[PDB]
């Protein structure tokens, strides 16, 4: 049970590290509001606190998603709604020439989050997600296998992908 507490801790701590890392990249932030980093490094935080305070205000959709994984929040609507935002945000930055470039970046973003969540079906509804991704990417140049390859890379098995896809 000691192990239980330790592992959960490692997970939550990791999230803060990720949030912390993103804060650096984010340009919405001000250096003087260093206070946030101090808070992040300073201690473990409540999940809700992390979610409500950090993820939503800084629109870190990926982090939010991962966090809810640990929480194990099942609610599909909320989970899906969060996914919609991530996808929508991605569209904003893109310009078109980088169809391929965005193609990679998009796959990159998805795979990373995908690796963390993919083990559980609630955040990563493979069935729901695949079409969603295709639909998103559809308004882009296409090469076949672009969508599925990401899931394979995500950590999804060939056998799992096959049955769902066939369905």
């Amino acid at each position: 049970e000691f192990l239980h507490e330790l592992e959960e801790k490692m997970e939550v701590a990791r999230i803060q590290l990720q949030i912390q890392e993103t804060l650096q990249r984010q340009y919405s932030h001000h250096s003087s509001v260093q206070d946030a980093v101090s808070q992040l490094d300073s201690e473990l935080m409540d999940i809700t606190k992390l979610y409500g305070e950090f993820a939503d205000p800084f629109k870190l959709a990926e982090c939010k998603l991962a966090i809810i994984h640990c929480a194990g929040y099942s609610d599909p609507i909320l989970v899906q709604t969060l996914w919609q935002d991530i996808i929508e945000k991605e569209l904003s930055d893109s310009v078109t020439l980088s169809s391929s470039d965005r193609m990679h970046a998009l796959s990159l973003k998805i795979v990373l989050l995908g690796k963390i969540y993919a083990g559980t079906p609630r955040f990563f509804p493979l069935d729901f997600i695949v079409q969603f991704l295709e639909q998103q990417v559809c308004t882009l140049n296409w090469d076949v296998g672009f969508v599925i390859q990401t899931m394979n890379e995500i950590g999804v098995p060939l056998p799992r992908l096959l049955e769902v896809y066939d369905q």
Partner: protein, 56 residues
């Protein structure tokens, strides 16, 4: 600066940043994070920030 490379960019200039970025990517005994990040900067620049490009 690997996490913010604007500062390098500002002082040094974009070209020089790219060059250094290339060296870090290639550079040996470097952490994967560093190499990947530098590769990313070299290849894509900063997303929705500094763009990497030929201009007429």
């Amino acid at each position: 600066l690997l996490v913010e490379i604007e500062r390098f960019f500002k002082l040094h200039q974009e070209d020089q940043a790219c060059a250094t970025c290339l060296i870090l990517a290639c550079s040996t005994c470097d952490r994967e994070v560093s190499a990947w990040a530098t590769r990313a900067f070299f290849r894509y620049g900063g997303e929705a920030q500094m763009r990497f490009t030929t201009l007429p």
